[PDB]
Amino acid sequence: EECMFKDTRLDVLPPQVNPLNAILAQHTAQTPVHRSLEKRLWTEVRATAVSE
Amino acid sequence: LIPVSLVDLININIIFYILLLYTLLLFFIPLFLASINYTYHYIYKYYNYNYNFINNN
């Protein structure tokens, strides 16, 4: 009843959770493993492309 | 008894009383509505959007 006569903003703060983790986890769960290993090839070939 | 009377049942004088009373009520409604509640002060002070940033690394 005395909510107006308090300062409870510290008792209720916005969480520091990154929602991106929930997104990337759903991304890996849907993909297979050989595509995960392929991404290491896509990155490596991109490095050699920038090198040449 | 005096108040036991059919003349006092539809008394035009009391009807004038009611008329003037509620016309004045209508005139003064915008002053009766002029009381302040402190709820939007609370909403401004306590509503805190999430200020944390995204950091993939």
CSV table of C-alpha atoms in Angstrom, one decimal:
chain,number,residue,atom,x,y,z
A,1,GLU,CA,0.0,0.0,0.0
A,2,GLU,CA,3.0,2.3,0.6
A,3,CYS,CA,4.6,1.6,-2.8
A,4,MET,CA,4.7,5.3,-3.6
A,5,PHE,CA,6.8,6.1,-0.5
A,6,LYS,CA,9.6,3.8,-1.3
A,7,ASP,CA,12.4,3.4,-3.9
A,8,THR,CA,12.6,-0.3,-4.9
A,9,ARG,CA,14.3,0.2,-8.2
A,10,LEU,CA,17.3,-1.7,-6.9
A,11,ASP,CA,15.2,-4.7,-5.8
A,12,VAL,CA,14.0,-4.9,-9.4
A,13,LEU,CA,16.7,-4.3,-12.0
A,14,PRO,CA,16.8,-5.3,-15.6
A,15,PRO,CA,18.7,-8.6,-16.1
A,16,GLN,CA,22.1,-8.7,-17.7
A,17,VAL,CA,21.2,-11.7,-19.8
A,18,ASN,CA,22.3,-11.6,-23.4
A,19,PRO,CA,19.4,-12.9,-25.6
A,20,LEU,CA,21.9,-13.6,-28.4
A,21,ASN,CA,23.0,-16.7,-26.5
A,22,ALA,CA,19.5,-18.1,-26.7
A,23,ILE,CA,19.5,-17.4,-30.5
A,24,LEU,CA,22.9,-18.9,-31.3
A,25,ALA,CA,22.0,-22.0,-29.2
A,26,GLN,CA,18.9,-22.5,-31.3
A,27,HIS,CA,21.0,-22.0,-34.4
A,28,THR,CA,23.5,-24.8,-33.5
A,29,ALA,CA,20.8,-27.2,-32.4
A,30,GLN,CA,19.2,-27.0,-35.8
A,31,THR,CA,22.4,-27.3,-37.9
A,32,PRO,CA,24.4,-30.5,-38.3
A,33,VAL,CA,28.0,-30.9,-37.3
A,34,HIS,CA,29.5,-31.1,-40.9
A,35,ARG,CA,28.1,-27.6,-41.5
A,36,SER,CA,29.9,-26.5,-38.3
A,37,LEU,CA,33.1,-27.9,-39.7
A,38,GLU,CA,32.4,-26.3,-43.0
A,39,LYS,CA,32.3,-22.9,-41.4
A,40,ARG,CA,35.9,-23.4,-40.4
A,41,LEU,CA,36.6,-23.9,-44.2
A,42,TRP,CA,34.6,-20.8,-45.1
A,43,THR,CA,36.6,-18.8,-42.7
A,44,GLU,CA,40.0,-20.3,-43.7
A,45,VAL,CA,39.3,-19.8,-47.4
A,46,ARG,CA,38.3,-16.2,-46.6
A,47,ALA,CA,41.7,-15.7,-44.9
A,48,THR,CA,43.6,-17.0,-47.9
A,49,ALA,CA,41.4,-14.9,-50.2
A,50,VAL,CA,42.3,-11.8,-48.2
A,51,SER,CA,46.0,-12.9,-48.2
A,52,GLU,CA,46.1,-13.3,-52.0
B,1,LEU,CA,-49.4,17.3,8.7
B,2,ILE,CA,-47.9,20.0,6.5
B,3,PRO,CA,-45.4,17.9,4.5
B,4,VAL,CA,-48.2,15.4,3.8
B,5,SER,CA,-49.5,17.3,0.8
B,6,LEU,CA,-50.0,16.7,-3.0
B,7,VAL,CA,-49.0,20.3,-3.6
B,8,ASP,CA,-45.5,19.4,-2.3
B,9,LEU,CA,-45.3,16.3,-4.5
B,10,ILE,CA,-44.6,18.2,-7.8
B,11,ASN,CA,-43.5,21.5,-6.2
B,12,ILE,CA,-42.1,23.6,-9.0
B,13,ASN,CA,-39.9,25.5,-6.4
B,14,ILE,CA,-38.0,22.3,-5.5
B,15,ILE,CA,-37.7,21.6,-9.3
B,16,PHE,CA,-36.1,25.1,-9.7
B,17,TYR,CA,-33.8,24.1,-6.8
B,18,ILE,CA,-32.8,20.9,-8.6
B,19,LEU,CA,-32.4,22.7,-11.9
B,20,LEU,CA,-30.1,25.4,-10.5
B,21,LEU,CA,-28.2,22.9,-8.4
B,22,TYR,CA,-27.3,20.6,-11.3
B,23,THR,CA,-26.7,23.4,-13.8
B,24,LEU,CA,-24.1,24.7,-11.3
B,25,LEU,CA,-22.8,21.2,-11.0
B,26,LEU,CA,-22.3,21.0,-14.7
B,27,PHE,CA,-20.7,24.4,-14.7
B,28,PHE,CA,-18.2,23.3,-12.0
B,29,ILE,CA,-17.4,19.7,-13.3
B,30,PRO,CA,-14.0,20.8,-14.8
B,31,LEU,CA,-13.0,22.0,-11.4
B,32,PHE,CA,-14.0,18.8,-9.7
B,33,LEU,CA,-11.8,16.9,-12.2
B,34,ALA,CA,-8.8,19.0,-11.2
B,35,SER,CA,-7.3,16.7,-8.6
B,36,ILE,CA,-3.8,15.3,-9.3
B,37,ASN,CA,-2.8,11.7,-8.9
B,38,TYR,CA,0.9,10.7,-8.6
B,39,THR,CA,0.8,7.6,-10.7
B,40,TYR,CA,2.6,8.8,-13.7
B,41,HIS,CA,5.3,10.2,-11.5
B,42,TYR,CA,5.8,6.7,-10.3
B,43,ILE,CA,5.8,5.4,-13.9
B,44,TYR,CA,8.4,7.9,-15.0
B,45,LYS,CA,10.6,7.2,-12.0
B,46,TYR,CA,10.4,3.4,-11.9
B,47,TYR,CA,10.0,2.4,-15.5
B,48,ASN,CA,13.6,1.4,-16.5
B,49,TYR,CA,14.2,-0.1,-19.9
B,50,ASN,CA,17.0,-2.6,-20.1
B,51,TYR,CA,20.2,-0.6,-20.5
B,52,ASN,CA,22.5,-3.5,-20.9
B,53,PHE,CA,24.3,-3.8,-24.2
B,54,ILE,CA,24.9,-6.8,-26.5
B,55,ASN,CA,28.4,-8.2,-26.6
B,56,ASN,CA,29.0,-11.4,-28.7
B,57,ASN,CA,32.6,-11.7,-27.5
